[PDB]
Amino acid sequence: EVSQDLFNQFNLFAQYSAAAYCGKNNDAPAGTNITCTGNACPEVEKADATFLYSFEDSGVGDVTGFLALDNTNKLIVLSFRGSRSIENWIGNLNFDLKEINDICSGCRGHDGFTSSWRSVADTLRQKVEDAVREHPDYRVVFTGHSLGGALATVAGADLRGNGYDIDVFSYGAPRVGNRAFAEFLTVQTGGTLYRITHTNDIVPRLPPREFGYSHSSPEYWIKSGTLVPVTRNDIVKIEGIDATGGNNQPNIPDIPAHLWYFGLIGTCL
């Protein structure tokens, strides 16, 4: 339901997203090769990818992640890590919205995710600009799973049209703002947003629509089971804001589904 090529990018950034949790980045030297424990990111290892900068508990919302260069694929990946503990993170979740005219007008976004990014958008924006210029023929990409996915999306909105096209791949990302914002994310130029969901996974269902949140379009839904391998024939593109019939359905949601995006994600073996 997507091309073999699109599937491959979904799989590759699924792993880049995974690395935010299982790569040994902790205070890892700039320039080092990116590796992950427990086979979390083989395709990243299979490439000429190195850390260009790494961050932890960075800024006011404790953002954590890393920026990287892929000479094999010609990319400049910014990966955001989600919570060290997603289950608790899910229950501590606050649904409060906050004015974000700066991104767009009449756009309201999750206060937490937005504050977290502004606080770090300065340090990180420059680190990114330095890279395109060196690798201008290299696709810049923003990625993240769970909370990390939300952070990647906000950054992907806050940073478009400065010169370079920013593509975003999010995995099991929560809703990030109000209907206006979803509208924006669905049509914004200077990039494409790939919002990937899996089976019933609960995070893409929060905050609720009943708290004023809304999802951008389209949605790339993975129909294959938890712990089951994903083929191109298992993903479905679902068009239209807040479309239902994908991950946005009225059944009982699940947390394990959130940890399986093409592989093991959000946790390390």
Place this chain on the structure above:
Amino acid sequence: EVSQDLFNQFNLFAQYSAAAYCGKNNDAPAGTNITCTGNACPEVEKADATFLYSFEDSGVGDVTGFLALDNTNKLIVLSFRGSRSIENWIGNLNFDLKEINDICSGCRGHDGFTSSWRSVADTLRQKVEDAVREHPDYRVVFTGHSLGGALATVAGADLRGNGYDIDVFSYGAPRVGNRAFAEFLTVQTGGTLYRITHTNDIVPRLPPREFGYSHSSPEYWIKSGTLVPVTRNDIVKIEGIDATGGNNQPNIPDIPAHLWYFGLIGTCL
């Protein structure tokens, strides 16, 4: 390199072993359907399988597991759960042997494992017997992963030749006794033992042969990677006591390899 049927059996008991960690099982009423969270045991769920007896922290080794009834595949299954923290369990493992001429002559076995089985053998032999009585037509199978696979192996060598066959399927089980014992476990009749290992899994390398431990024969070694699906051409039968070229190879071992045996095992999503 294995018959589709044996493969299906390996997969089935990997799940029964996985069920010992991810089933609801902690206080469930006998008669209750066996289910697991995070898609840890679809084959067991798809079977008319129920709890015959659940035990938690029983005896002196804080043994945990369950006795089950499967009418779909006609089995009585005794599944032992490995440790709740395997890395710490690995670190605290002590290599002490203790004499076990009751099991076989010249036989010495890991004090801990043998001790722990001993403390619960009466109750379990009992419940197993009731089950057999009620189901003469049923194949009795002991199974377990990591420490649970050790207990499974002991229990089975202990209660065999009571006129009922015992098959044992262990997943990443440590060495359990001395060479005399290994030799026994290799030739004992009234039920086969299928030792199953994966790649560079660390546990089947403990305790070290250096401390007087040995591995029974044969060994079913899974060649496929961690998080990679197993096909019957990925399993290799390694004949010979203390045979190398399976899991017993001179390279650095890995814990993640321990948590994969034809699906996620020893941990729950």
